[PDB]
Amino acid sequence: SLDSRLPAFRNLSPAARLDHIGQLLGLSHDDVSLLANAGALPMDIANGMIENVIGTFELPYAVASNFQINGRDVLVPLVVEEPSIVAAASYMAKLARANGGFTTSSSAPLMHAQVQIVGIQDPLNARLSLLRRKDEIIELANRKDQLLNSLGGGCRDIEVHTFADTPRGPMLVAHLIVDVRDAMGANTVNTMAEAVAPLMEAITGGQVRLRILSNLADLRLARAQVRITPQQLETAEFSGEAVIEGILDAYAFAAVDPYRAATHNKGIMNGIDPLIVATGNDWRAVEAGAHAYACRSGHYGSLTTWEKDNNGHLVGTLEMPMPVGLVGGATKTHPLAQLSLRILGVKTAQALAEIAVAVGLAQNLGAMRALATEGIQRGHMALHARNIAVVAGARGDEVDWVARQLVEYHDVRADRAVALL
Q: Which residues bind ligand NAD (CB under 6 A)?
A: 82, 145, 147-148, 151, 153, 180-188, 215, 263, 266, 282, 285, 325, 327-329, 387-388, 391, 414
What is the smallest separation between the CB atom of 139 and ligand MEV, expressed in angstroms?
26
Per-residue binding string, a second copy, 355-394, x by CB under 8 A, is ----------------xx-xxxx--xx-xx-xx--xxx--
Question: What is d(CA 123, CA 137) in angstroms, rounded to the nearest whole number?
Answer: 18
Question: What is d(CA 314, CA 306) in angstroms, rounded to the nearest whole number?
Answer: 7
Q: Check residue 367 for interaction with ligand MEV (CB under 6 A).
A: yes
Catalytic residue among 20, 144, 266, 308: 266
What is the smallest separation between the CB atom of 320 and ligand NAD, expressed in angstroms?
15
Using CB under 6 A, which of 366, 384, 388, 389 touches ligand ZKE?
366
- Pick between residue 40 and residue 365 the one whose CB is nearest to ligand ZKE: 365
Q: What is the DSSP letter of 304?
A: E
Q: How many residues bind ligand ZKE (CB under 6 A)?
A: 26
Q: What is the DSSP letter of 259?
A: H
- Residue 396 interacts with which of ligand MEV, ligand ZKE, a second copy, none, CB < 5 to 8 Å by class: none
Under rule CB under 8 A, which residues in 39-68 are in contact with a second copy?
39-41, 43, 46-65
* DSSP reduced 3-state for 22: helix
- Pick between residue 100 and residue 419 the one whose CB is nearest to a second copy: 419
CB burial readout 152-163, b (16+ within 10 A) else e? ebbbeebebebe
The amino acid present at 125, given as its one-letter code, is N
CB 217, CB 296: distance < 8 Å = no
Q: Check residue 51 for interaction with ligand ZKE (CB under 6 A).
A: yes
Question: What is d(CA 27, CA 344) in angstroms, rounded to the nearest whole number?
Answer: 12
Under rule CB under 6 A, which residues in 91-150 are in contact with ligand ZKE?
91, 94
Question: What is d(CA 101, CA 95) in angstroms, rounded to the nearest whole number?
Answer: 8
Query: Is 380 part of the annotated catalytic residue set?
Result: yes
Under rule CB under 6 A, which residues in 270-329 are in contact with ligand MEV?
270
Which region, judged by CB under 6 A, interacts with ligand MEV, from 12-20, 31-39, 260-268, 340-348? Answer: 260-268
CB 76, CB 67: distance < 8 Å = yes
Q: Check residue 87 for interaction with ligand ZKE (CB under 6 A).
A: yes
Q: Check residue 7 for interaction with a second copy (CB under 8 A).
A: no
Question: What is d(CA 44, CA 411) in angstroms, rounded to the nearest whole number?
Answer: 47
Give the nearest residue (CB) to ligand MEV. Answer: 267
Query: Is 266 part of the annotated catalytic residue set?
Result: yes
- Residue 325 interacts with which of ligand ZKE, ligand NAD, ligand MEV, none, CB < 5 to 8 Å by class: ligand NAD
Question: What is d(CA 283, CA 264) in angstroms, rounded to the nearest whole number?
Answer: 18
What is the smallest separation between the CB atom of 267 and ligand ZKE, expressed in angstroms?
3
CB 341, CB 97: distance < 8 Å = no
Using CB under 8 A, which of 122, 234, 241, 287 touches a second copy?
287
Using CB under 6 A, which of 127, 264, 291, 384 touches ligand MEV?
264
What is the smallest separation between the CB atom of 379 and ligand ZKE, expressed in angstroms?
2
DSSP string covering 313-375, please? Answer: -EEEEEEEE----SSSTHHHHSHHHHHHHHHHT--SHHHHHHHHHHHHHHHHHHHHHHHHTT-
What's the distance, Cα to Cα, between the start and end of the chain in Å? 54
Active site residues: 82, 266, 282, 380
